[PDB]
Symmetry: D2
Subunit: 359 residues, 4 copies
């Protein structure tokens, strides 16, 4: 159990950007710029800095060339410069390794703290950032699949309750979770900015990065991404979806970048900003919890995720989950799911929904 520090938590606004290490920068730029339409804030031979249509901070995604694809940092914006000091004190009290750079780790960010957090994830906290042209009314640029915001991260970690407590102390509130009737938590979603999530925990071997999520305005924009992927004959890079989530109630799509970093495209979750926002707990065997329409969750969605780096840039060693596996208990050999609680009709025993089994 991760103790609550005496030192006050930094006041975190929102998820702000991810730095992903990529192996072939030109290939990755083709994906995020040509395919997905993100806007270039800056690039050179080593990095690409990208932002969403409605962003005014410098970037929402930095692609950094390196030998091993991995998450290098997941960055949260804090409310004041002094919150960066607070973050440093808070993580030092937690016994975590920290690194402070007054002029930033990446271009367009100023004073910044990176930490190896207690779950082994590389978090950044910053306030200072170079404002850029906010493109929110640049409909001359707007794509049929336009990514309008950065929405959230999702982290794979072996012990969800341990992580959840730590994130709650840091001021995130859990909006939804997935549990069973035997005490196991499989996943949790938690926010600062008043949407369903700024980050999220998925039970599994970790630390690994499950995905980064961008929003669109409307559901047809997500459909267009799928359609465009078909036209580009890269439909094999559509992992899962499109669908309606149970958890979050968002319309969603998961796609895979050239280094298999998973990207979620997301729209129309709900307001969570009230402090007594009702926490929704879904049962792990409810077949409408992940896809509301009951479509089966591909096994890769549970098993595959990106490496994460330490502050030296080396891959963090993976710690195996010992709690029950969501995959196993729902679609595995001894798995079970239901459409209606207590009804055998529309239930699935040892296989996935809709007539499929694990490959």
């Amino acid at each position: 159990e991760i103790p609550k520090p005496v030192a006050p938590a930094p006041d975190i606004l929102r998820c702000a950007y991810a730095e992903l290490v990529v192996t072939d920068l030109a290939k990755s730029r083709n994906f995020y710029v040509d395919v997905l339409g993100l806007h270039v804030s800056y690039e050179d031979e080593n990095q690409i800095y990208l932002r969403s249509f409605e962003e005014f901070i410098h970037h929402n995604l930095v692609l950094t060339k390196g030998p091993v694809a991995a998450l290098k940092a997941m960055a949260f914006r804090v409310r004041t410069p002094e919150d960066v000091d607070k973050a440093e004190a808070y993580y030092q009290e937690l016994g975590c390794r920290t690194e402070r750079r007054k002029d930033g780790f990446v271009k367009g960010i100023g004073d910044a703290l990176r930490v190896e957090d207690p779950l082994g994830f590389p978090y950044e906290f910053f306030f200072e950032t170079t404002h850029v042209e906010r493109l929110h009314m640049r409909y001359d640029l707007y794509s049929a699949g336009e990514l309008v915001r950065l929405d959230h991260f999702n982290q794979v970690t072996p012990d969800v309750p341990r992580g959840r407590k730590y994130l709650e102390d840091l001021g995130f509130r859990v909006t939804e979770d997935i549990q069973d009737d035997e005490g196991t938590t499989y996943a949790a979603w938690m926010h600062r900015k008043g949407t369903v999530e700024d980050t999220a925990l998925t039970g599994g071997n970790g630390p690994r990065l499950h995905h980064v999520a961008f929003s669109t305005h409307e559901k047809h924009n997500i459909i267009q991404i799928c359609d465009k992927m078909g036209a580009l004959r890269i439909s094999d890079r559509i992992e899962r979806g499109p669908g309606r989530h149970g958890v979050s109630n968002a319309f969603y799509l998961y796609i895979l970048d050239p280094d298999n970093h998973r990207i979620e495209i997301y729209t129309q979750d709900y307001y969570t900003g009230d402090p007594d926002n009702p926490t929704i707990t879904w049962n792990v065997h409810d077949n409408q919890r992940r896809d509301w329409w009951g479509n089966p969750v591909v096994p890769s969605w549970y098993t595959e995720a990106s490496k994460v780096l330490d502050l030296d840039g080396n891959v963090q060693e993976i710690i195996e989950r010992t709690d029950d596996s969501e995959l196993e208990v729902t679609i595995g050999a001894d798995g079970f799911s239901f459409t209606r609680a207590g009804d055998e009709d529309g239930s699935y025993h040892g296989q996935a929904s809709k007539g499929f089994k694990l490959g």
Copy 2:
């Protein structure tokens, strides 16, 4: 099947299906309360339903009976005389016909039913009772509104044989699915200038694969899925939602209380020019049925509705001997590709996206 000397009836479009249903109240709940179709007439025996933009009496007749099945798939013809032409055409084909001057179902007049050469019960009619066209009744409009009847899809063992017959009847092939060794797995064909009025799916038959209704927009289809989740009947969402390859339409397949399959469809393309370019897809192309490469659930290939003869008895099934689309794509000896010739993004002995057959 030979081309008759007699002229084909001039067919306008698919118009309505009569489905036999076993429990009329449960079927009513599905078609009216879940799907929002509009009642034109009902009694203890039948429910007559129409789509939002329709002016003819109905697009769907649900008839209570002992064995769920397709009883008639009906096409409207251009003139009263075309019913006489249909009768002569099918008589020359040596098919059983039955003519009723005052119709088989309410709101249809002079009508001919035939057991066609493929074993399917076709109706041809001109005369129909017009009703209030609800197309601007936005006070009634559902978030999932079904706006038109679009097409039928028929399961039949020998696709080329059926195709040639429909071509003689004036349907024109728009798209099809073949392999490199000359097998045909499916064909789509039209009269009204959309991708299909009816379509042939290779398989044991005669069976009715589905009846399709349109929506205005893609979000309307999404809403049907969402509503089915809220009603906790997501298990009746068979396949989708998706984008089709063939037709380019956004789609969904759902199952009614008797397992009759309904497609919801939108935004296919114009085919009314006589030299409309045909499109042939390779059976192993994993974008042909779902453009996004999502797997086709095996029930989509195997399950379909019984059809009746003109006495109300079930038509006997003839087995397909040509290769099975399921088997050559997603079975244990199957394969499909994302890019022709590329092993990356290819699937061998299983479906796309990491699933095998359950």
Copy 3:
């Protein structure tokens, strides 16, 4: 009135393309390609040939550089090559001037007949056309405002009944119209392809071309055109809309090209293919007939339209409408409209709505 020929009418499939004369080709190209996203089928220093997303024939729009902006031809595809000969015999019997070019008037069209029709409009009939790549699944090209089909033309003409009967003899079926209780017809819509319209007649001084219309898939695509025009700071070229039509039930927008040629963007009218398709007549004073939400129709919509050319390329002289003016009876000083017939609440007298 225009007598029915004994010669058989050509079998007309649909509206197919318009040739518009434009004064500055590069400015026109910016509007139709860069703003509206139409797809280049051919271009040179004198002409740009453009098509919609789902088209397989060579083009839906030809922009031709010339001294005077005008409609040069409104072209219908016919069902067979022999239908061009039928069109020639038909228009000759009508006493109309015709010109036949076996190798076409514009690139990508073959054997073609142009006529000065009885209403003074330059019609073209052709069958042969060069097929091109049908872009309907090219979602790598698809714009947020994508124009997917050519839908129809709309013609200003002084005597709507006279034109309507002529078009009916040619096989067009009227789907909707606007009339009053005194028996005046103000507009009619008519089709071959089984939508609400391939061409339409608006009562006014003519021959003039009121608009060319393109379809989108969905209503948001039309919204995007407006939003894009705002971002390009050319919102002054949004003439009317976006709205829901009463007539046609379509979602719509009217915009103006650099020569003030009017383009409609249109989606989601209904099927009219059955021969007893019910015809809808609206009362001219019904304030929901043109915009279903009761938004006012700006006067320019009724008064402004494009010149049309004769076969020598000279502008056709205009004949003034003598029947009542829809503008005058609805939004002019002695005009009126209602929301609910017979209710003075929601009625407008001597001005427009809202």
Copy 4:
């Protein structure tokens, strides 16, 4: 100038609900429930408590039968019970009339403070509220025009700078505003919850309530409201729109209830929660500031607004704006607006855009 209290401001979460006095409870029910599809949390013979599709607090709208149609309370929810204490001390230091009830003024709200604020508006602050079934996944109920959230209020007040300063001291941050080159402010928008607005000031004679705004998921849902109103042959109750706003970038529609209370339907503005969120100032003569597509703003939109009540339920006296009138300077007889700054082409003199 309204002074900044020594007392700390309450932590305000968001706009939460409005209480509207209406004259015919059945006709108002028909509008809000049958036409617009809002969900009934509670009703009796005197009041109807309505909520949006995604709401979990008891209600977003209370219709209260009474003799004079008016805003009775615009309510904001605060972060903690102790913030209702903070509110009370804050408004007392401002010399405002206050009234606190530990068991609420309306059903479904607990300890609540109502005030006559320095601009003459009845504000309520509360934390405690009865939770109800959150209908956000009830797609069996979802309307083609579904109203999903309460988004904001908009207030008519004669002196916008004066009001703006007061709201900023209260913790609202200005996101967008409308000014001219002569030092006049015509409108401002300001937020707590990280959208463009929780309330907004429109320069005019006041206090009056300009509108209450509800969100939809998508733009087509707003189009459907218009289409439905045509089918019901009540298109005359569509005042303005649908449109794209300049200010806020939201897709919008303004309609009128049976007592002429103005309702906005709104979707797809942007995130403002960062504390250095860039302000956007529009010039009052820019014809894309209110409707981005340049559609004219009808004069009633500027002139008409709802009465508001004091804490005794009497109508607040209206104070006249003496600053320049947005109507007059843009669409009046000596008005002006432009499409492109400095371009005569596409400008309008003494008249509204589009003919």
